[PDB]
């Protein structure tokens, strides 16, 4: 089974290799800068005293670690080979899976947190504490470990037509456990998060549209337009950034596709789109947060 090593036979052209290179470089730089800026502002100014800032910092840390794997992936694409050895293969793959799930589970938590605030305001008094935010981050990390730890054992370098593939090795039969992993990744990293955020935000908007305030209906319609607009943005960004690579992985598990320039370029673009979610999360969840905005 191929993983990082892409069957590229038919050496790349000039414009495509530069494009894929600029892709990995730009997403990495933007992702690292935006998330380190969030972590700096939190550590320097806001101080992480609130549940919201505890979630924001956890999201920025995961998003920074996710994009920190891109220099390895770029070089792996350039040379058409993994040159960093067996230990770094285990470390980068584990970090990559750990922080895909940590990033995604944290932004799901922020959706559930806002749903609880609106639809269960009494229970929100118990849930929205800094103590519970740290507990939730730990529980989400334990859940992420169900895949992040096994891939540390499964990941290894093996020879593949002279070149080196940093890939995963599975128990027997490989065709069962490899596809189970792909399915579990698809449902825990994409299907479940899309369901959580659409239902939580949808129920949040429905509750906000049901209030009738005897006086200022204009002020209510205005806030509802802004909240509904933000809901549509954060959901559309998640779907645009994560759907392509998840569907691409499933299709390659089912059929064999003709190795062409368009397939190669689209594959790395879909990979890059997944990491662009880590680039946009600082905007959606930190710089546009109501309290974080004020502290700039």
């Amino acid at each position, epitope marked *: 089974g191929s993983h990082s090593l892409c069957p590229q036979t038919g050496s790349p052209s000039m414009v495509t290799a530069i494009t894929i290179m600029a892709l990995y470089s730009i997403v990495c730089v933007v992702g690292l800068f935006g998330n380190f800026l969030v972590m700096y502002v939190i550590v320097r100014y806001t101080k992480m005293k609130t549940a919201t800032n505890i979630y924001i910092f956890n999201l920025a840390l995961a998003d920074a670690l996710a994009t920190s794997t891109l220099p390895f992936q770029s070089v792996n694409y350039l040379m058409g080979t993994w040159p960093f050895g067996n230990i770094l293969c285990k470390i980068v793959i584990s970090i990559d899976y750990y922080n895909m799930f940590t990033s995604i589970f944290t932004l799901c938590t922020m959706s559930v947190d806002r749903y609880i605030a609106v639809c269960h*305001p009494v229970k929100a008094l*118990d849930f*929205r504490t800094p103590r519970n935010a740290k507990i939730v981050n730990v529980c989400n990390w334990i859940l992420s470990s169900a895949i992040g730890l096994p891939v540390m054992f499964m990941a290894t370098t093996k020879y593949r037509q002279g070149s080196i593939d940093c890939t995963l090795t599975f128990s027997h039969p490989t065709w069962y456990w490899e596809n189970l992993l792909k399915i579990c990744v698809f449902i825990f990293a994409f299907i479940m998060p899309v369901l959580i955020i659409t239902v939580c935000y949808g129920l949040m908007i429905l509750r906000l549209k049901s*209030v009738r305030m*005897l*006086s*200022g209906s204009k*002020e209510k319609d205005r806030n509802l337009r802004r909240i509904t607009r933000m809901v549509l943005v954060v959901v559309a960004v998640f779907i645009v950034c994560w759907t392509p690579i998840h569907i691409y992985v499933i299709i390659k598990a089912l059929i064999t596709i003709p190795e062409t320039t368009f397939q190669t370029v689209s594959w790395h673009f879909c990979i890059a789109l997944g990491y662009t979610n880590s680039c946009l999360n600082p905007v959606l969840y930190a710089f546009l947060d109501e309290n974080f905005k004020r502290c700039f």
Partner: nanobody
Amino acid sequence: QVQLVESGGGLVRPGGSLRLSCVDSERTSYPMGWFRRAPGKEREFVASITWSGIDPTYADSVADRFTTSRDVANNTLYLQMNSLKHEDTAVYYCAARAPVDYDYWGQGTQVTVSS
């Protein structure tokens, strides 16, 4: 005009908990802020929350111990106070905004933290 009804105050031992609530049942205003005045101090901001109930704002002195929420369905404002200290002994005031700084203030509720 507007009548803010504050509830839940009173006496608690140090380290105990209190839940304040504030309602404007006439829907003529939105209770959204909590202030307090210690016996010898000036009036100080405690917590506030947006109309949507989504985004609370806490004073640094209480961020680790207090939580606020808003029931948008019945226009009720809540303040959950945990791990109460002597420095939390004060009169707590509910503040509300008119649908059209705050426009209305409750008469206050005494919170006294004593052994």
